[PDB]
């Protein structure tokens, strides 16, 4: 896919600012290597990044690799998906439903 891997708070801030400047929504997958359903839904997140390439920005945050971002985002259960617009959180979805992830991305690609 074209998912962007976040490796630091500085990278996070730069991506959120990019989505603001471009007026494109950002969808973020908060994931962990130990999370079974996270690994199950990762292929779909990749496919969606291709399907919406150029329209929606896709980010990935490994919560243990970038704990400062996971903490600031208030993560507690996984998978968690966030949508950012204008640099701030606009929507979220917690859980491994593939139908619901598809619907979240479709809603913001059309909004």
Swiss-Prot record:
UniProt keywords (A-Z) are: Cytoplasm, Disulfide bond, Electron transport, Redox-active center, Transport
Any one cellular-component term (Gene Ontology) = cytoplasm
Signal peptide start-end:
none
Indicate where this protein resides in the cell: Cytoplasm
Q: Which residues form the active site?
A: 35 (nucleophile), 38 (nucleophile)
The cross-references to Pfam families, in alphabetical order and at most eight, read: Thioredoxin
Principal localisation: cytoplasm
Database matches in InterPro entries: Thioredoxin-like_sf, Thioredoxin_CS, Thioredoxin_domain
Q: Where is this site: Contributes to redox potential value?
A: 36-37
Domain Thioredoxin positions: 1-110
SUPFAM superfamilies to which the protein is assigned, alphabetical: Thioredoxin-like
> PROSITE patterns under this entry?
THIOREDOXIN_1 (PS00194), THIOREDOXIN_2 (PS51352)
Q: List the disulfide bonds.
A: 35-38
Q: Which domain of life is it from?
A: Eukaryota
Other remarks in the entry: This thioredoxin cannot be used as a substrate for E.coli NADPH: thioredoxin reductase, but is a substrate of spinach ferredoxin-thioredoxin reductase and can activate NADP-MDH.
The record's similarity note reads:
Belongs to the thioredoxin family. Plant H-type subfamily.
Per the entry, what this protein does is: Participates in various redox reactions through the reversible oxidation of the active center dithiol to a disulfide. The H form is known to activate a number of cytosolic enzymes.
Descriptive protein name: Thioredoxin H-type
Q: What is the organism field in this record?
A: Chlamydomonas reinhardtii (Chlamydomonas smithii)
* Classification of source organism: Eukaryota, Viridiplantae, Chlorophyta, core chlorophytes, Chlorophyceae
